[PDB]
Amino acid sequence: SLETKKAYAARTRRSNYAASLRLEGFKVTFADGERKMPTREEV
Amino acid sequence: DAYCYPGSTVLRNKLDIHDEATLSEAEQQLSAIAADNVEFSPPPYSLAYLQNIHRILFSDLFEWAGELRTVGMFCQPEYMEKEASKIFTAMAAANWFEGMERAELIAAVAEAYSDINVVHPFREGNGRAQRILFEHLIMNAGFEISWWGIEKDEWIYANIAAYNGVMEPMEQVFEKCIGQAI
Ligand SMILES: [Mg+2]
User: What angle do CA B69, A22, B40 make, to 5 degrees?
Assistant: First the structure.
């Protein structure tokens, strides 16, 4: 269960955070949670 | 507020950003990448667990990422550790909701979410860090979780209802976000 719990979290965390951003008012859709993410290279 | 720039409402950040619009886009992007590096961890959960999530999310922008509120807003700062300890101790006494059926888990998670929300440990970013913790809480209990189950307007009203002690709107939120067993 532990290894499956970590596997489930890794599968869903990126989509869940995009949804969590939407709850805070950020203009983020479901497709944004599925997109590739850029690397950390803050401008 | 001391967390903000002098004569402004924008919080001081590591990138020296001074208007609120460009800081949200920087915060949204940089914290999203960080959210993709948070792994599920087993209980016991705690305030320090919550702080660890907040630090991972916002350490690229705020020095106080992971640190607790120093000013008031809610539970005042000097009582936040006591109040969070009460909540997490009660959650631990209930085996972190493991063994509970779906119907029971929904009512307990809804009440636990509002209780922790009243603590409000951080100057900013409380909701996002809290929901990642509740993601781990629900899948440790053994159930799927997706915040796409509700929209923003429903989420705001459920939290307002919870401020006034009415939890039924918070319960149907988790009724719609908690799914099948893993
Ligand atoms: Mg909230």
Answer: 65
| Helix axes of B47-58 and B20-35: crossing angle, nearest 10 degrees | 120
Residue B131: inside a domain:
yes
B11 within a domain of the structure (yes/no) = no
**Residue A23 resides in a domain:** yes
| Residues of the domain holding B111 | 40-181
Handedness of CA A25, B118, B85, A3 (dihedral sign): negative
> Residue B49 domain-assigned?
yes
**A interface with B, Cβ–Cβ below 8 Å:** 1-2, 4-6, 8-10, 12-26, 28, 30, 37-40, 42
Give the method used: X-ray
Contacts of B136 (CB under 8 A, 6+ apart): A9, B40, B41, B45
Q: Tokens representing B135?
A: 């993601």
* Resolution value (Å, 1 decimal): 2.5
Domain that holds residue A16: 2-34
Cβ of B142 within 8 Å of Cβ of A1? The answer is: yes
**DSSP-based helix, strand, coil % in chain A, nearest 5:** 65, 0, 35
B169 close contact with A: CB closer than 8 A: no
Structure tokens given for B7 = 């004569």
Residues of A in contact with B42 (CB under 8 A): 2, 5
* CB-closest option in B39, B60, B128 to A20: B128
The answer as to whether B107 is a domain residue is yes
Domains identified in chain B, total number: 1
